[PDB]
Enzyme design. Structure first.
Site, PDB file in Angstrom:
ATOM      1  N   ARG A 108     -10.303  67.718 -86.288  1.00 54.02           N
ATOM      2  CA  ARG A 108     -11.577  67.463 -85.639  1.00 54.02           C
ATOM      3  C   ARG A 108     -12.293  68.678 -85.351  1.00 54.02           C
ATOM      4  O   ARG A 108     -12.134  69.379 -84.321  1.00 54.02           O
ATOM      5  CB  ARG A 108     -11.197  66.713 -84.459  1.00 54.02           C
ATOM      6  CG  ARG A 108     -10.246  65.737 -84.559  1.00 54.02           C
ATOM      7  CD  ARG A 108     -10.597  64.468 -85.371  1.00 54.02           C
ATOM      8  NE  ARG A 108      -9.398  63.734 -85.830  1.00 54.02           N
ATOM      9  CZ  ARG A 108      -8.822  62.658 -84.717  1.00 54.02           C
ATOM     10  NH1 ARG A 108      -9.481  62.676 -83.225  1.00 54.02           N
ATOM     11  NH2 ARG A 108      -7.922  61.938 -85.153  1.00 54.02           N
TER      12      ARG A 108
ATOM     13  N   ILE B 205     -17.818  48.792 -88.453  1.00 53.90           N
ATOM     14  CA  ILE B 205     -18.501  47.677 -87.997  1.00 53.90           C
ATOM     15  C   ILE B 205     -19.480  47.839 -86.710  1.00 53.90           C
ATOM     16  O   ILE B 205     -19.064  48.152 -86.000  1.00 53.90           O
ATOM     17  CB  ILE B 205     -17.238  46.591 -87.763  1.00 53.90           C
ATOM     18  CG1 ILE B 205     -16.297  46.412 -88.655  1.00 53.90           C
ATOM     19  CG2 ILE B 205     -17.680  45.343 -87.054  1.00 53.90           C
ATOM     20  CD1 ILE B 205     -16.881  45.808 -89.965  1.00 53.90           C
ATOM     21  N   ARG B 206     -20.736  47.414 -87.167  1.00 52.47           N
ATOM     22  CA  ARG B 206     -21.693  47.673 -86.205  1.00 52.47           C
ATOM     23  C   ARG B 206     -22.621  46.456 -85.951  1.00 52.47           C
ATOM     24  O   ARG B 206     -23.779  46.765 -85.358  1.00 52.47           O
ATOM     25  CB  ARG B 206     -22.747  48.941 -86.627  1.00 52.47           C
ATOM     26  CG  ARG B 206     -21.816  50.260 -86.526  1.00 52.47           C
ATOM     27  CD  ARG B 206     -21.416  50.722 -85.498  1.00 52.47           C
ATOM     28  NE  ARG B 206     -20.664  51.971 -85.677  1.00 52.47           N
ATOM     29  CZ  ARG B 206     -19.212  52.054 -85.698  1.00 52.47           C
ATOM     30  NH1 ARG B 206     -18.624  51.007 -85.735  1.00 52.47           N
ATOM     31  NH2 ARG B 206     -18.787  53.353 -85.854  1.00 52.47           N
TER      32      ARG B 206
ATOM     33  N   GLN C  49      -0.397  49.233 -79.422  1.00 57.26           N
ATOM     34  CA  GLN C  49      -0.701  50.275 -80.556  1.00 57.26           C
ATOM     35  C   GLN C  49       0.438  51.277 -80.406  1.00 57.26           C
ATOM     36  O   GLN C  49       0.580  51.665 -79.207  1.00 57.26           O
ATOM     37  CB  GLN C  49      -2.011  50.747 -80.818  1.00 57.26           C
ATOM     38  CG  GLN C  49      -1.976  52.103 -81.633  1.00 57.26           C
ATOM     39  CD  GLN C  49      -1.733  53.332 -81.251  1.00 57.26           C
ATOM     40  OE1 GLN C  49      -1.768  53.631 -79.971  1.00 57.26           O
ATOM     41  NE2 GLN C  49      -1.016  54.200 -81.918  1.00 57.26           N
TER      42      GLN C  49
ATOM     43  N   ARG D 220     -11.270  59.789 -89.002  1.00 61.15           N
ATOM     44  CA  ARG D 220     -10.730  60.975 -88.086  1.00 61.15           C
ATOM     45  C   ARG D 220      -9.516  61.302 -88.713  1.00 61.15           C
ATOM     46  O   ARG D 220      -9.054  62.503 -88.028  1.00 61.15           O
ATOM     47  CB  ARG D 220     -10.565  60.176 -86.815  1.00 61.15           C
ATOM     48  CG  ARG D 220     -11.895  59.621 -86.141  1.00 61.15           C
ATOM     49  CD  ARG D 220     -11.267  58.748 -84.896  1.00 61.15           C
ATOM     50  NE  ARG D 220     -10.783  59.601 -83.509  1.00 61.15           N
ATOM     51  CZ  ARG D 220     -11.577  60.322 -82.805  1.00 61.15           C
ATOM     52  NH1 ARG D 220     -13.038  60.304 -83.062  1.00 61.15           N
ATOM     53  NH2 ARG D 220     -10.851  60.632 -81.597  1.00 61.15           N
TER      54      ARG D 220
ATOM     55  N   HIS E 116      -9.079  55.115 -90.354  1.00 63.37           N
ATOM     56  CA  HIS E 116      -8.959  55.894 -88.918  1.00 63.37           C
ATOM     57  C   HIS E 116     -10.145  56.137 -88.604  1.00 63.37           C
ATOM     58  O   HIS E 116     -10.382  57.294 -87.738  1.00 63.37           O
ATOM     59  CB  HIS E 116      -8.013  56.743 -88.815  1.00 63.37           C
ATOM     60  CG  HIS E 116      -7.195  56.977 -87.330  1.00 63.37           C
ATOM     61  ND1 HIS E 116      -5.900  56.545 -87.359  1.00 63.37           N
ATOM     62  CD2 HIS E 116      -7.903  57.278 -86.288  1.00 63.37           C
ATOM     63  CE1 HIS E 116      -5.503  57.259 -85.856  1.00 63.37           C
ATOM     64  NE2 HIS E 116      -6.685  57.512 -85.381  1.00 63.37           N
TER      65      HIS E 116
ATOM     66  N   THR F  27       0.625  52.488 -85.924  1.00 62.48           N
ATOM     67  CA  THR F  27      -0.365  53.325 -86.578  1.00 62.48           C
ATOM     68  C   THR F  27       0.394  54.271 -87.444  1.00 62.48           C
ATOM     69  O   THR F  27       1.398  55.066 -87.017  1.00 62.48           O
ATOM     70  CB  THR F  27      -1.033  54.143 -85.605  1.00 62.48           C
ATOM     71  OG1 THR F  27      -2.026  53.204 -84.682  1.00 62.48           O
ATOM     72  CG2 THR F  27      -2.374  54.989 -86.453  1.00 62.48           C
TER      73      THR F  27
ATOM     74  N   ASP G 286     -10.959  47.871 -90.507  1.00 65.87           N
ATOM     75  CA  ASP G 286     -11.754  48.513 -89.600  1.00 65.87           C
ATOM     76  C   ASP G 286     -12.574  49.540 -90.072  1.00 65.87           C
ATOM     77  O   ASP G 286     -12.486  49.934 -91.318  1.00 65.87           O
ATOM     78  CB  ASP G 286     -11.263  48.884 -88.181  1.00 65.87           C
ATOM     79  CG  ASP G 286     -10.307  49.974 -88.446  1.00 65.87           C
ATOM     80  OD1 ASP G 286     -10.413  50.905 -89.403  1.00 65.87           O
ATOM     81  OD2 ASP G 286      -9.583  50.115 -87.392  1.00 65.87           O
TER      82      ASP G 286
HETATM   83  C1  LIG Z   1     -11.997  58.122 -79.778  1.00 66.26           C
HETATM   84  C2  LIG Z   1     -11.081  57.664 -80.800  1.00 66.26           C
HETATM   85  C3  LIG Z   1      -9.854  57.461 -80.480  1.00 66.26           C
HETATM   86  C4  LIG Z   1      -9.167  56.608 -81.206  1.00 66.26           C
HETATM   87  N1  LIG Z   1      -7.674  56.461 -80.888  1.00 66.26           N
HETATM   88  C5  LIG Z   1      -7.015  55.972 -81.548  1.00 66.26           C
HETATM   89  C6  LIG Z   1      -5.421  55.762 -81.474  1.00 66.26           C
HETATM   90  O1  LIG Z   1      -4.911  56.313 -80.436  1.00 66.26           O
HETATM   91  N2  LIG Z   1      -4.673  55.052 -82.186  1.00 66.26           N
HETATM   92  C7  LIG Z   1      -5.261  54.476 -83.225  1.00 66.26           C
HETATM   93  O2  LIG Z   1      -4.214  53.978 -84.138  1.00 66.26           O
HETATM   94  N3  LIG Z   1      -6.383  54.691 -83.837  1.00 66.26           N
HETATM   95  C8  LIG Z   1      -7.031  55.203 -82.853  1.00 66.26           C
HETATM   96  N4  LIG Z   1      -8.673  55.305 -83.334  1.00 66.26           N
HETATM   97  C9  LIG Z   1      -9.179  54.693 -84.667  1.00 66.26           C
HETATM   98  C10 LIG Z   1      -9.648  53.231 -84.177  1.00 66.26           C
HETATM   99  O3  LIG Z   1      -8.515  52.460 -83.851  1.00 66.26           O
HETATM  100  C11 LIG Z   1     -10.186  52.658 -85.251  1.00 66.26           C
HETATM  101  O4  LIG Z   1      -9.531  52.892 -86.468  1.00 66.26           O
HETATM  102  C12 LIG Z   1     -11.726  53.043 -85.574  1.00 66.26           C
HETATM  103  O5  LIG Z   1     -12.324  53.685 -84.214  1.00 66.26           O
HETATM  104  C13 LIG Z   1     -12.370  52.124 -86.257  1.00 66.26           C
HETATM  105  O6  LIG Z   1     -13.717  52.790 -86.540  1.00 66.26           O
HETATM  106  P1  LIG Z   1     -15.102  52.462 -85.818  1.00 66.26           P
HETATM  107  O7  LIG Z   1     -14.779  53.363 -84.503  1.00 66.26           O
HETATM  108  O8  LIG Z   1     -15.968  52.868 -86.547  1.00 66.26           O
HETATM  109  O9  LIG Z   1     -15.238  51.030 -85.283  1.00 66.26           O
HETATM  110  C14 LIG Z   1      -9.601  55.894 -82.390  1.00 66.26           C
HETATM  111  C15 LIG Z   1     -10.895  56.205 -82.600  1.00 66.26           C
HETATM  112  C16 LIG Z   1     -11.763  56.705 -81.846  1.00 66.26           C
HETATM  113  C17 LIG Z   1     -13.154  57.112 -82.151  1.00 66.26           C
HETATM  114  O1  LIG Z   2      -7.894  59.411 -83.388  1.00 65.54           O
HETATM  115  C1  LIG Z   2      -7.430  59.530 -82.098  1.00 65.54           C
HETATM  116  O2  LIG Z   2      -8.227  60.157 -81.341  1.00 65.54           O
HETATM  117  C2  LIG Z   2      -6.296  59.119 -81.952  1.00 65.54           C
HETATM  118  O3  LIG Z   2      -5.774  58.194 -83.044  1.00 65.54           O
HETATM  119  C3  LIG Z   2      -5.342  60.211 -81.656  1.00 65.54           C
HETATM  120  C4  LIG Z   2      -4.392  60.734 -82.512  1.00 65.54           C
HETATM  121  C5  LIG Z   2      -3.686  61.898 -82.277  1.00 65.54           C
HETATM  122  C6  LIG Z   2      -3.442  62.160 -80.907  1.00 65.54           C
HETATM  123  C7  LIG Z   2      -4.403  61.552 -79.772  1.00 65.54           C
HETATM  124  C8  LIG Z   2      -5.153  60.530 -80.204  1.00 65.54           C
END
Ligand SMILES: Cc1cc2nc3c(=O)[nH]c(=O)nc-3n(C[C@H](O)[C@H](O)[C@H](O)COP(=O)(O)O)c2cc1C
Ligand SMILES: O=C(O)[C@@H](O)c1ccccc1
Ligand SMILES: Cc1cc2nc3c(=O)[nH]c(=O)nc-3n(C[C@H](O)[C@H](O)[C@H](O)COP(=O)(O)O)c2cc1C
Ligand SMILES: Cc1cc2nc3c(=O)[nH]c(=O)nc-3n(C[C@H](O)[C@H](O)[C@H](O)COP(=O)(O)O)c2cc1C
Ligand SMILES: Cc1cc2nc3c(=O)[nH]c(=O)nc-3n(C[C@H](O)[C@H](O)[C@H](O)COP(=O)(O)O)c2cc1C
Ligand SMILES: O=C(O)[C@@H](O)c1ccccc1
Ligand SMILES: O=C(O)[C@@H](O)c1ccccc1
Ligand SMILES: O=C(O)[C@@H](O)c1ccccc1
Ligand SMILES: O=C(O)[C@@H](O)c1ccccc1
Ligand SMILES: O=C(O)[C@@H](O)c1ccccc1
Ligand SMILES: O=C(O)[C@@H](O)c1ccccc1
Ligand SMILES: O=C(O)[C@@H](O)c1ccccc1
Lengths: 335, 335, 335, 335
Positions: free
Chosen positions: C162, C264-265, C125, C233, C230, C153, C261
């Site tokens: 957040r 999904i649980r 990624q 988030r 995402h 991404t 995504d």
């Molecule tokens: C703690 C955390 C960190 C994440 N970090 C990234 C990241 O660094 N890059 C990215 O593309 N997505 C990131 N995501 C998004 C996930 O790839 C994904 O889109 C998301 O977790 C999917 O939803 P789910 O957690 O409900 O399965 C992150 C998600 C979480 C919860």
């Molecule tokens: O959702 C997340 O935490 C990641 O995609 C993330 C995004 C930006 C900086 C650090 C980590």
């Protein structure tokens, strides 16, 4: 001082015996239709108009040949002595004074002639009886006493299954009787014709929900219908009247008056009903809450509150008359 | 440090007397329209765009001949001294410093000339008075003092039924007055024309919900409209402005500015309003929460938070300008 | 023994420090999009087929030139050492053993080369960096280390707001670092082209929600997209990917792989995603719950549970292959 | 005295061991389909007809060559000795006395020949076995014993994931056995043909949800189908049968009987199913509640209550026959 109809329910619950409150509040079965009457009204939002002339806002309507002060009548509610010792006389007096028609019941706890003698605009609600001649005699009695319309209830071939009443073992106190008598038969279209042939009064069919039954009512010579699920007390799972109202109004195309009831709890709800096309509404339970809480004066206060709420809602929506309110549009929301 | 607008409501509830908090928070009737303003926004989801140039994201708009820093103005809220001793002056100063227009009220608790002297981009909100000349004099006073637009409130032929105020027995403290005076008449389309003929300023009709009233506003020479149910304080059961906005934007077809208000509680909500076609939003209650919580500095912090949230939401949605945000699509969900 | 993914969340909440659990669980703003990801899946019902040959049910797919054991990959989740001391190595080992691709993050807390050395099917990624050459160097490093796809991404021009992290004052412990480094720039379509020109690997754009962005991704030479908000988030109020998936699948018309995504649980949710047209899903938070609860063995158990649930759901729905599951119809309900 | 089916659930919960109540009450996975069966019925409202002849209201139907007293049969429920020592014999006796068909299970805890000897209208439910000859032998046994229909369950290639049973560690007590035996294979369309060729009895496919599977069932020579998600016990996320019923009835166009099950809890629910086009319903859990609460007499009382509720609902809706009830219209509401 009551500022909403909900103030009156609270007051009535305090004073009434539980089983009598349950007889009043309850519906049939799981009470799905009882709840849906409220849900349906709460989903309706009005699209108000602005900047219209409001120099002479009037809530009056003409219905069945006479003026009414509001687009509202008191619904037929059996056995009003259950709620207050003056029963039907208290309610009829307050209705008269407010300029609102009062519907005298076949199962009134004071005789129809006594209630009619109060004056005002009495209507008479008919149940069809096993003994047909008894039915037609009630109609003639009502007409002789000066009732202005026959409200033929068509959704009670028998009483629904009131589970609160069954669980409470509810029965009339010895001191409450059906004062018009000294037993239900299902009504049919033939019964409607027999009534129509026996009176010069407008016949109003109460409990119509199907569009084709509304059409047939017009064809049968009805002067009006009440689109109604009987306050959720008859078929549990019957659609709310308010949900069928617009389609019914379109189908009858001015051929009769189209009233609605079920869950009207404010002047805003009256506005919603009007905007969906109703000629007028009936109000049941709230009138009995007021009667229970404070007798004739209670009913007077309720009707004054409703009158103020109707005026307020109409004016805020840009409507100087009930006809203008019928031309308002609505939009369903989410609650 | 406040990280959401909800932090400010909590702060305001702590400090304000209950009856004053209720005057601020409440709506008319059952508060159906008050709640629906929030429900409607929560149902809207944005379809963001990705991979667009965000090297110079700007939240600025041009409206009524001047730049504003955000697609937002402070809504007219009567009697701001109820919330803080500096009242309207505190809010106007913070709005000026943030580059946000401030709407001076007919019922301001500091005179319109004093509030206009603060500077910034003052607009003036008009109520139509029984004494017409009084209305037109207020308009001339506002124009003479440098107000840039006349926001004619058209949804208050009289005040709605505020049941919280009725139950609290709410009245203005002796120390809060209508400082522009030393009484409502319903406004009509004739009133709008009288105002339009008396000023060179753009006239903005606030409280339009019907599509045909929006069309008529354009035909009447309005420079803008605010699509609004008055924060749920006027007709209880009035549709939320946000639900009518898209249809209204399509109908006016660029003929005037189309603003919206009711329930805006974040930069994301501003984005939603913009995506549905709004030129700008008004924000009412949150500005008063900030005023109550921390005076001028509180309002400054609120506006800085909103500015950051708007920038954040726009960029995450791929929008370098407010015009781009207006071209976003939306999809209704379930909450 | 875990019988659902919800057992693993409970286990993870017990062990993790509150602020770390919040970093994992939380979304942006009011968490509207976080909740909507679940709401959307819960509204979908599958119309299963009966009486089909299930003698060789297989959950395998081919994607980006290799077989995967399930239509699933581990989503990119930054800083996995936050959840367990073995961090990314534990998760990658379990993914390898289960035959599931693992997405190595730009912000991995173990270097991408170390994680790739675990074996399996590593994807990488990419976040776009202010320093472009840094971005393209990461791509080359990933390719040199044997990563099979670049998951670019595209929904993080900057990190969303957040509020849990802000309220907790959350910061990385000194013992967790971005191990690929010894700073975000917004990505654009030009960035995508620069990556596509610099690698022979399929480029997968993660965070697409608009139908026209999906079309443009195909035109841009993407090998896949991930339809995603995402995990709620980024933009608060962004539509769930699952709600856009069907429309996107129709629009790209086999031109690239379409993953989804968010929320999904269960294996049943995988079935729903497949039935709506997804090639495969990503799973984020549940994988981290398992890691927190029991390290590598925890992740193994999660993936075995998901595999069993997927097989169960597919067979009960009459699907001997993932392609057959994609041909299932769905119907929205009410929850 | 029980006045609703909900009275019987309360009674059954009191008497049954928790793990047995859970075996009865539970569904697969998250129980989404179990809940949706109830949600779907609660969303349906009936549009009743008024003023029709109700002099001879009959709830009888003809199905599979014989009269039934109600448009209802007892659903196949495995291992009825779990709920009461008399198990299937108690239920079959009560069904016989009420004029309701009883479905004997492949996994009955009393032999099919013993249950058939009770008399009445026994049907036989078939599971397809790994050993095919075993399946066809059961069919021949059922036919030899006087069963009138073969209800081939087609939605159990294997048992769903019952998380309550897994968490409880549920197993049959030593005193409950599969009494027809001294192991599942997935059924296919070939299995259906083998059964059809081996019997003169009508073959009824239970567990059909897809419209094309209903069409194929008719083409395959089925005498009926049961539109069903197996009470939410098989695929978690399977659409409720009641939601597919209308579309299926239209598609089969009188080519076979179309039954429905899942969540029928009153005579009103029977009316709803009929109004949506069902020939008849199956009732599962409530029959077992009655068995648990009071054995044969309990089941008798349940069936008498259901009979009264069906008669009541039909008459209140203006239906003198089940055919008339099938011609009722419905309208979806909000609960
Ligand atoms: C703690 C955390 C960190 C994440 N970090 C990234 C990241 O660094 N890059 C990215 O593309 N997505 C990131 N995501 C998004 C996930 O790839 C994904 O889109 C998301 O977790 C999917 O939803 P789910 O957690 O409900 O399965 C992150 C998600 C979480 C919860
Ligand atoms: O959702 C997340 O935490 C990641 O995609 C993330 C995004 C930006 C900086 C650090 C980590
Ligand atoms: C206690 C009670 C008794 C009623 N009695 C009658 C009756 O005798 N005849 C009749 O036509 N309707 C009767 N109704 C129905 C009402 O006329 C009316 O349809 C219903 O009350 C309207 O709903 P509302 O109570 O929500 O206003 C009764 C309702 C109640 C609550
Ligand atoms: C306490 C209070 C006083 C208000 N006074 C006025 C007023 O004098 N004139 C007016 O046009 N609108 C008035 N409004 C309505 C606001 O301008 C605006 O329509 C509403 O506050 C927007 O909704 P919001 O509060 O949810 O942001 C008032 C609102 C509140 C809450
Ligand atoms: C405890 C239990 C056991 C069941 N066993 C069987 C079975 O052996 N065969 C079958 O076809 N269906 C079986 N079913 C499904 C029922 O036939 C029927 O589809 C379901 O109970 C209908 O839903 P209801 O319980 O909500 O009325 C069973 C259901 C329950 C609750
Ligand atoms: O709903 C009610 O209570 C009345 O319509 C009613 C119906 C039947 C008998 C007595 C009273
Ligand atoms: O479906 C519709 O729009 C109407 O049947 C309707 C539904 C709910 C309330 C009022 C009117
Ligand atoms: O909503 C409000 O409070 C104002 O619009 C308002 C209306 C009428 C009188 C005073 C104040
Ligand atoms: O019905 C629609 O789509 C709009 O009226 C609408 C409804 C709810 C929120 C925003 C917009
Ligand atoms: O509106 C629709 O049907 C889709 O956008 C959709 C909505 C909710 C869940 C999945 C799919
Ligand atoms: O749902 C149930 O319990 C039955 O259909 C059943 C299915 C499989 C084995 C035993 C019993
Ligand atoms: O969507 C529809 O109208 C039907 O599928 C339906 C939905 C919910 C209950 C019964 C029937």
């Amino acid at each position: 001082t009551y500022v909403s109809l909900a103030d009156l329910e609270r007051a009535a619950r305090d004073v009434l015996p539980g089983e009598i409150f349950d007889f009043l509040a309850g519906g049939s079965g799981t009470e799905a239709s009882l709840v849906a009457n409220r849900t349906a009204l709460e989903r309706v939002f009005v699209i108000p108009r602005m900047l219209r002339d409001l120099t002479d806002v009037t809530t009056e309507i003409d219905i069945f040949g006479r003026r009414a002060a509001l687009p509202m009548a008191v619904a037929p509610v059996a056995y009003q002595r259950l709620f207050h010792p003056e029963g039907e006389l208290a309610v009829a007096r307050a209705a008269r004074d407010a300029g609102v028609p009062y519907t005298i019941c076949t199962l009134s706890s004071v005789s129809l002639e006594e209630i009619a003698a109060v004056g005002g605009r009495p209507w008479f609600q008919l149940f069809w009886l096993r003994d047909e001649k008894r039915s037609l005699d009630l109609v003639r009695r009502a007409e002789d006493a000066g009732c202005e319309a026959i409200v033929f209830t068509v959704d009670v071939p028998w009483m629904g299954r009131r589970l609160r009443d069954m669980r409470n073992g509810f029965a009339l106190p010895e001191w409450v009787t059906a004062a018009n008598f000294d037993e239900f038969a299902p009504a049919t279209w033939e019964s409607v014709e027999a009534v129509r042939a026996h009176t010069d009064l407008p016949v109003v069919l109460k409990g119509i929900l199907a569009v084709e039954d509304a059409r047939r009512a017009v064809d049968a010579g009805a002067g009006g219908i009440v689109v109604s699920n009987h306050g959720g007390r008859q078929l549990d799972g019957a659609v709310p009247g308010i949900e069928m109202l617009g389609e019914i109004v379109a189908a009858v195309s001015g051929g009769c008056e189209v009233l609605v009831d079920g869950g009207i709890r404010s002047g805003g709800d009256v506005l919603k009903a009007t905007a969906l096309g109703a000629s007028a509404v009936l109000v049941g339970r709230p009138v009995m809450w007021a009667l229970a809480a404070a007798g004739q004066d209670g009913v007077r206060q309720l009707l004054e509150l409703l009158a103020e709420e109707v005026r307020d809602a109409m004016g805020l929506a840009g409507c100087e008359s009930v006809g203008a309110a019928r031309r308002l549009n609505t939009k369903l929301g989410v609650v």
